[PDB]
Amino acid sequence: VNSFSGYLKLTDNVYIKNADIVEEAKKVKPTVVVNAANVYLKHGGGVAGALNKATNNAMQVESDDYIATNGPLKVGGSCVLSGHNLAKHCLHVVGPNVNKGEDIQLLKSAYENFNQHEVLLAPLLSAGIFGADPIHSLRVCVDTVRTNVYLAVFDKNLYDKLVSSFL
Ligand SMILES: O[C@@H]1CC[C@H](Nc2ncnc3[nH]ccc23)C1
Numbered sequence: 001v002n003s004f005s006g007y008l009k010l011t012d013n014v015y016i017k018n019a020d021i022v023e024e025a026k027k028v029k030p031t032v033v034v035n036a037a038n039v040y041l042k043h044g045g046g047v048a049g050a051l052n053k054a055t056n057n058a059m060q061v062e063s064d065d066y067i068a069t070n071g072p073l074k075v076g077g078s079c080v081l082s083g084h085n086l087a088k089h090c091l092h093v094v095g096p097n098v099n100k101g102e103d104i105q106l107l108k109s110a111y112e113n114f115n116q117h118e119v120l121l122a123p124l125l126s127a128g129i130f131g132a133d134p135i136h137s138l139r140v141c142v143d144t145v146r147t148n149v150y151l152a153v154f155d156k157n158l159y160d161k162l163v164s165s166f167l
Pocket of ligand 1: 019046047050124127129130153154155
C-alpha cells in the first residue's frame with residue numbers, strides 16, 4: 001500500500017492521473033519524482049521548469065554543480081539528484097526531444113531508467129515541449145517500465161485522450 005490517490009490503473013504496474021506533478025509531488029513526497037530533463041540539466045520550461053521553480057531554483061543550483069563535475073547526460077540517460085522539497089530523490093531522465101531531431105527509439109532507453117526504482121511519480125517522457133506523441137510515450141512506458149509508475153498528466157484534455165485510446 002502506498003499514498004498515491006485517485007489514479008486510474010492501466011496495467012499491473014502503471015497508473016495515471018490528471019494532475020500537476022508539482023502539486024502531486026508536494027502532497028505525496030514520493031521517494032522518487034522523475035524530471036523531464038535535458039542533457040545539460042537546464043530546467044527552463046515544461047515539467048523541468050515547473051519542478052525547478054517549486055524548489056526556488058535549488059534544483060538548478062545542484063544541477064549546475066553536477067554538470068560542472070560530470071559533464072552532460074546522454075539522451076536516454078539519467079542521474080539521481082536530490083528531490084529537494086518535492087521528493088526524497090529526483091531522477092532526471094533525458095527523453096529524446098523531437099524538436100531537436102533526436103531519435104525516438106531512444107525513448108525506450110529513457111524509460112528503462114525507471115526500472116532502477118521500485119516506485120516513481122513521473123511525467124510522460126518526451127511529451128509536452130519535447131515534441132513526441134504522448135500516446136506513443138504511454139505505450140512505450142507500459143511496454144518498458146516494470147516497476148510501479150504513477151504518471152501525472154497536466155492537461156485534462158490529453159489525459160482523457162490517453163485513457164480513451166489506451167489498448
Ligand atoms: O511539456 C508539456 C507541457 C506541460 C505538459 N507536461 C506536464 N506533465 C505533468 N505535470 C506538469 N506540470 C507542468 C507541466 C507538466 C506537457
